[PDB]
């Protein structure tokens, strides 16, 4: 019931009690660990509501006060009457900050309490969604001095009037299969791009075409919009030592903004809740650039560095990887766009874990996602035992809308 | 039930049925994953089903399930258990058992090799000197002048828990660590406590940065005894770099034979508390962990100093740069001296092939992603992208408490 986690580099042992407040299921059993798997009515709603208001009122030191009991009554009244209920602005902000706080795959949670919440629950159309999103984009980007933000569209009702951003992130690049057989641009977005084209988008068929937004309001058929090019801050990639690096013609965008997740607060479901912070360097330079099913540039880069690519044991892939990652960090820092390196981010997360342990009784963390995709063991998180469990409010995966939508 | 795992790089999907045969616990529950936790005297009653399960597995593997030889062996084992409270494995079963413990070892990336294991039967051993002799022969055999061969040596099983055979060393070959009065450490900080025990037992310490530790060997529950492995049997590799000529002046070397000696081998309910085994190194074990962990030799600074990297900010990736150069050095050195070693690309790629074959032929391959993914360059290896299922099959290798914590000293 009381659980210990040990850091094997420092011997510091922490005690976790927060896991006893765990709501949802992990995917694991006593027989099988699924730690590495990517994706493992009125009566339902009141305990969920209660559980949430209880933690809310506890957080503002007013547990069992008049205002607390009155609110539970009011919400109780409203559920019984309307089958759903509405959050106060205060609850909405608390809920969103806590969904981030509870995100076990997020290394950047030291920042959790500095989140700008944009309430877009008064939104009714796709043009309105586009407006809200442009405003979020400009606010978060802040001319390169990035600020964390979330924009929250209206909650699910009967489930046939869902708000959804069909895009996986607000800003991503198009993917195109060619007669050649190869892939131009980002192979991860080939399918979404096809959906855009069949919906009407004139694709310029280039390597780094910022995708348009495909926005769905009120369960209606989704609609296309180009984000003002002037609002999409992009960074050309160069190297502080390699003159040739720029000739690869690589760029990335400054704003990482996940737009396909579902925010659950007090049982209510917010199916459109795009949020953004800022990049850790490895996300772009290791994953986006070097994954075999992504831009897959290691082969080209190693060539230009004239490494011996005959045998895997020369560590040529490893050498190029480091340089590509040096260039990403340098390019962002030179253009004054917020970015964090994996050493600094993981050092912060360890400090955050210690704060959460002493102030909250723990910190759900998924080691598989928290450890950076390069240089794992030279970052402190590699050596830190973590317990993974699901707390609410939460960000959840949800099915991609094209498989769900009834046109 | 059928469980699917996906590779997110290739979209190849595999189906696991093998997990249905898993008995032991993971530490995880429906409410908590303990997948990153390092560490999450049997009755007659508990012993017979364990023996039965094992013997059924053994007889199935040789295509003799339900045969007269199978049934006679169950009855013979049953009788032996009721009469003596334990039983003895036939040589054939011991070999099968030891190979399957390796096959089942979910944290081992080298399992493509599982069917090629030389098993040395040391169950006739009675004394610490006997153990020393067995271990010397294991080292010489496995080393093979640099052309490493996988091996395990199996000492007598647990009886009453008061007569255990144990190798107190965590690996047969390791370097001493010494805590200085000024709080710094000479040698390997991981081995300070064990080095202190050795000294107290009467080892005369040379007190340098790479002193091969003596063996501390416990036979039949007696107090352990010290022995020095003959130096001519300990193959070592001076570390140098293919392009950086100052690298040799760091004074680094490592030993060629990685030989885990502190684990417990479970076969058919029987417990083999001393079962040292060895394969060969994957380069990152030495170049990433042994050299660059902060709590190990911790050489990152000195290497980066010598490379003249910008060290004023982490975001130069200086640590990452030094790290790669050190790992190139380790692979180059071992290759140049004709000592078996495998790089993390080759080893992970082979593991994925192994894993896919096991799914097809066996119905699964339990694997601990946290341990399988190498400690540098994670996602440019195919294992990072492979979903895995972790579960516990027997025969198995298990952790056991350190013997200095449990031993009853006789004096
Ligand atoms: C402030 C800067 C932030 C940093 C440096 C950061 C860091 C990261 C990183 C590196 C990942 C892994 C991404 C991947 O591999 O695909 C991640 C995942 C995640 N983060 Fe953050 N984060 C930040 C802000 C935020 C914010 C503002 C939120 C929500 C308000 C958030 C919630 C999440 C969630 C839910 C995931 C998992 C997403 C998934 O499963 O795909 N993070 N974080
Ligand atoms: C043949 C070459 C082999 C290679 C390249 C290899 C590779 C590895 C590596 C890199 C690890 C992780 C080590 C660490 O981080 O401490 C490991 C773990 C392990 N391997 Fe192997 N292995 C090999 C042979 C063997 C053999 C012969 C056995 C036993 C018969 C074995 C059983 C295990 C076990 C039980 C672990 C887990 C150790 C622990 O939990 O501390 N392996 N393997
Ligand atoms: C199969 C495995 O779970 C998968 O590759 C994970 C591993 N760790 C990860 N870690 C992060 N941060 N992001 C990812 O997409 C992944 N992918
Ligand atoms: C806390 C964490 O489980 C621990 O540091 C693990 C991570 N993965 C590992 N993987 C291997 N191969 N060896 C290790 O010692 C570790 N250490
Ligand atoms: C969640 N993450 C954004 C994910 C972006 C993605 N990994 C990418 O590398 O493009 C993040 N840094 N939060 O803002
Ligand atoms: C288990 N592993 C050996 C472990 C050795 C350890 N990583 C070391 O570097 O000393 C191995 N390759 N087996 O042969
Ligand atoms: Zn688990």
Residue A301 sits in a domain of what CATH number? 3.90.1230.10
Residue of B nearest to A343 (CA): B314
Note whether B290 and B355 are same-domain residues: no
Q: What CATH number does the domain containing A66 carry?
A: 3.90.340.10
Query: Domain for residue B40, yes or no?
Result: yes
CA of residue A373 to ligand 3 center, whole Å: 8
Note whether B223 and B330 are same-domain residues: no
Give me the DSSP letters along A158-194: SSSS--EE-SSBSS-B-EEE-TTSSEEE-GGGHHHHH
Range of the domain at B323: 236-258+281-346
Ligand in nearest proximity to the CA of B36 = 4
Query: Domain for residue A33, yes or no?
Result: yes
Note whether A51 and A104 are same-domain residues: yes
Tell me, what DSSP letter sits at residue A210?
B
Note whether A104 and A140 are same-domain residues: no
The burial of A333, by beta-carbon neighbours within 10 Å (0-12 exposed, 13-18 middle, 19 or more buried), is given as middle
Cβ B377 vs Cβ B317: under 8 Å:
no
CA distance A399 to B13: 19
Q: Whose CA is nearest to atom 14 of ligand 1?
A: A283
End-to-end CA distance of chain A: 49
Q: Which atom of ligand 1 is nearest to the CA of A345?
A: 5
CA distance A251 to A235: 5
Note whether A239 and A304 are same-domain residues: yes
CB within 8 Å of A334: residues ≥ 6 apart:
A238
Query: Domain for residue B323, yes or no?
Result: yes
Measured in whole angstroms, the distance separating CA A176 from the mean position of its chain's CA atoms is 24
Q: Whose CA is nearest to atom 11 of ligand 1?
A: A106
Residues of A in contact with B390 (CB under 8 A): 32-33, 35-36
CA distance B40 to B378: 24
Given the DSSP bridges, would you call strands A149-152 and B259-260 parallel, antiparallel or unpaired? unpaired
Query: Domain for residue A135, yes or no?
Result: yes
- Of A71, A106, A166, A201, the catalytic one is A106
Note whether B184 and B298 are same-domain residues: no
CA neighbor of A152 nearest in space, from A130, A120, A122, A123: A120
Q: Where are the alpha helices (DSSP H) in A216-297?
A: 281-282, 289-290
Note whether A127 and A204 are same-domain residues: yes
Q: What is the CA radius of gyration of chain B?
A: 23
CB within 8 Å of B260: residues ≥ 6 apart:
B170, B171, B276, B277, B278
Note whether B172 and B202 are same-domain residues: yes
Note whether B137 and B230 are same-domain residues: yes
Note whether A215 and A87 are same-domain residues: no
Q: Whose CA is nearest to atom 8 of ligand 3?
A: A369
Number of domains within chain A: 3
Query: Domain for residue B387, yes or no?
Result: no
Is A369 close to ligand 4, i.e. is its CB under 6 Å away? no
Query: Domain for residue A392, yes or no?
Result: no
CA neighbor of B164 nearest in space, from B58, B41, B276, B55: B41
Query: Domain for residue A7, yes or no?
Result: no
What protein residues have CB closer than 5 angstroms to ion ligand 7?
A 28, 33, 35; B 28, 33, 35
CA distance B278 to B258: 6
Instruction: Compute the residue count for chain A.
Output: 407
Cβ B171 vs Cβ B157: under 8 Å:
no
CA distance A326 to B381: 20
Measured in whole angstroms, the distance separating CA A60 from the mean position of its chain's CA atoms is 27
Phi and psi at residue B361, in whole multiples of 5°?
Answer: -90, -30
Which residues are A35's β-sheet partners? none
| Token pair 């190869």: residue | A182
Residues of A in contact with B192 (CB under 8 A): none
CA neighbor of A248 nearest in space, from A210, A299, A282: A299
Tell me, what DSSP letter sits at residue B143?
H
Residue A291 in tokens? 């994954």
CA distance B325 to A227: 44
Query: Domain for residue B273, yes or no?
Result: yes
CA distance A255 to B41: 60
Q: What CATH number does the domain containing B218 carry?
A: 3.90.440.10
Tell me, what DSSP letter sits at residue A148?
-
Note whether A21 and A153 are same-domain residues: yes
Instruction: Compute the residue count for chain B.
Output: 411
Which residues are B264's β-sheet partners? B398
CA distance B374 to B370: 9
User: Resolution reached, in Å?
Assistant: 2.0
Cβ A46 vs Cβ A76: under 8 Å:
yes
* Residue A106 labeled ligand binder: yes
CA distance B42 to B270: 9
End-to-end CA distance of chain B: 55
Note whether A49 and A154 are same-domain residues: yes
CA distance A241 to B314: 17
């Amino acid at each position: 019931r009381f659980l210990k986690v040990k850091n094997w580099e420092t011997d510091v042992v922490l005690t976790d009690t927060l896991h006893l407040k765990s709501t949802l299921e992990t995917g694991c059993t006593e027989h099988i660990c699924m730690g590495s798997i990517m994706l493992p009515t009125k009566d339902q709603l009141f305990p969920l509501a209660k559980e949430f208001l209880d933690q809310y009122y506890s957080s503002i030191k007013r547990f069992g006060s008049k205002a607390h009991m009155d609110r539970l009554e009011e919400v109780n009244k409203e559920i019984e009457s309307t089958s759903t209920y509405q959050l106060k602005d205060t609850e909405l902000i608390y809920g969103a900050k806590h969904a981030w706080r509870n995100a076990s795959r997020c290394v950047g949670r030291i920042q959790w309490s500095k989140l700008q919440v944009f309430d877009a629950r008064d939104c009714t159309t796709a043009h309105g969604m586009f407006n809200y999103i442009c405003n979020h984009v400009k606010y978060a980007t802040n001319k390169g001095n990035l600020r964390s933000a979330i924009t929250i569209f209206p909650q699910r009702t009967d489930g046939k009037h869902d708000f959804r951003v069909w895009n996986s992130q607000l800003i991503r690049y198009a993917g195109y299969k060619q007669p050649d057989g190869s892939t131009l641009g980002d192979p991860a977005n080939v399918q979404f791009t096809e959906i855009c084209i069949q919906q009407g988008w004139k694709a310029p068929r280039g390597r780094f075409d910022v995708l348009p937004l495909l926005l769905q309001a009120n369960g209606n058929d989704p609609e296309l919009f180009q984000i003002p090019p002037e609002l999409v801050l992009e960074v050309p990639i160069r190297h502080p030592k390699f003159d040739w690096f720029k000739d690869l013609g690589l760029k990335w965008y400054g704003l990482p903004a996940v737009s396909n997740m579902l925010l659950e607060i007090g049982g209510l479901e917010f199916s459109a809740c795009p949020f953004s912070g800022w990049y850790m360097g490895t996300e772009i330079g290791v994953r986006d650039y070097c994954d075999n099913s992504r831009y897959n540039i290691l082969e080209e880069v190693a060539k230009k560095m004239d490494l011996d690519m005959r045998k895997t044991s020369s560590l040529w892939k490893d050498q190029a990887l480091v340089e590509i990652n040096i260039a990403v960090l340098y390019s962002f820092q030179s253009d004054k766009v917020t970015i964090v390196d994996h050493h600094s981010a993981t050092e912060s997360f360890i400090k955050h874990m210690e704060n959460e342990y002493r102030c909250r009784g723990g910190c759900p963390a998924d080691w598989v996602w928290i450890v950076p995709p390069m240089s794992g063991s030279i970052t402190p998180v590699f050596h830190q035992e973590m317990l993974n469990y699901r707390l609410t409010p939460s960000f959840e995966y949800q099915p991609d809308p094209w498989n769900t939508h009834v046109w």
